[PDB]
């Protein structure tokens, strides 16, 4: 199938409580494989998946040096953002960055990403062309001008087409027993009366990987989108994910309802009913 590599940076100021914290995490699809945390006793890029562990000392030194450099840059970025938004030095603020590459079955680049936020709001994003920018406001327009002058988009493009996809293909091979394995959901329907005349049907999906899934309830074959309570897909802590979908049905009409499940690990979409 298709796969993605994503890195996530969070830089958080905390005036009066030292320098800003910088945390980076790296993912292939829904599997985390590295972390860096400036608040750690000895900050280093560190393995979080067994298949990355075979990378040698030059890898870990390289990644660590890069994270320390990036942490410095983003601490300065936090100061710069204060001036761009006329903000005081007593407040805590957050910069977030996500970037990476998606590839298809053949390992060819599908698309690259490089997006940043300030205090949880879009700040500046690299467009899909990997050559132009979208700035969310007049502050980010200043950064955009700086990045245009420095041909930053050209640099990112080279990385996204090159190293990003190369490293992703390598990780996919090194972790092929897990990254290239989809675990289908284990599914069942529970039933609970609410009153004398209504009951809850809850459609469960457990133990699946990757996280992407669709649970839908149909009544007489029509989607009950507006009427379905859909909980956020959640991690079990063993790599797999969980989700459920629930609908309130009139007592005696339970068999008019079908739960529909779509997941990469299923050869065909499942249909279940309460039994």
């Amino acid at each position: 199938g298709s796969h993605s590599m994503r890195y996530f940076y969070t830089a958080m100021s905390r005036p009066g409580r030292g320098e800003p914290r910088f945390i980076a995490v790296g993912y292939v699809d829904d599997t985390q494989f590295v972390r860096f945390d400036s608040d750690a006793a000895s900050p280093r890029m560190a393995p979080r998946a067994p298949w990355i562990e075979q990378e040698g000392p030059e890898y870990w030194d390289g990644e660590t040096r890069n994270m320390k450099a990036s942490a410095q840059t983003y601490r300065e970025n936090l100061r710069i953002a204060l001036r761009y938004y006329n903000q005081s030095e007593a407040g805590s603020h957050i910069i977030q960055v996500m970037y990476g590459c998606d590839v298809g079955p053949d390992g060819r680049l599908l698309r690259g990403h490089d997006q940043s936020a300030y205090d949880g709001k879009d700040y500046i994003a690299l467009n899909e062309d990997l050559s132009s920018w979208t700035a969310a406001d007049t502050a980010a327009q200043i950064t955009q001008r700086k990045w245009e002058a420095a041909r930053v988009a050209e640099q990112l493009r080279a990385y996204l087409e090159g190293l990003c996809v190369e490293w992703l293909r390598r990780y996919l091979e090194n972790g092929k027993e897990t990254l290239q394995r989809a675990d289908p959901p284990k599914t069942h329907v529970t039933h609970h009366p609410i009153s004398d005349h209504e009951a809850t049907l809850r459609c469960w999906a457990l133990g699946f990987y990757p996280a992407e899934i669709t649970l839908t309830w149909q009544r007489d074959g029509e989607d009950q989108t507006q009427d379905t309570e859909l909980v956020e897909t959640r991690p079990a802590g063993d790599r797999t994910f969980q989700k459920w979908a629930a609908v309130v049905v009139p007592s005696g009409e339970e068999q008019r309802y079908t739960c529909h499940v779509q997941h990469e690990g299923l050869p065909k979409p499942l249909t279940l009913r309460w039994e």
């Binding site: 970025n77 970037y99 700086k146």
Partner: peptide, 10 residues
Amino acid sequence: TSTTSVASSW
């Protein structure tokens, strides 16, 4: 590097 080393100031 696997991460990008392209970090340009805001």
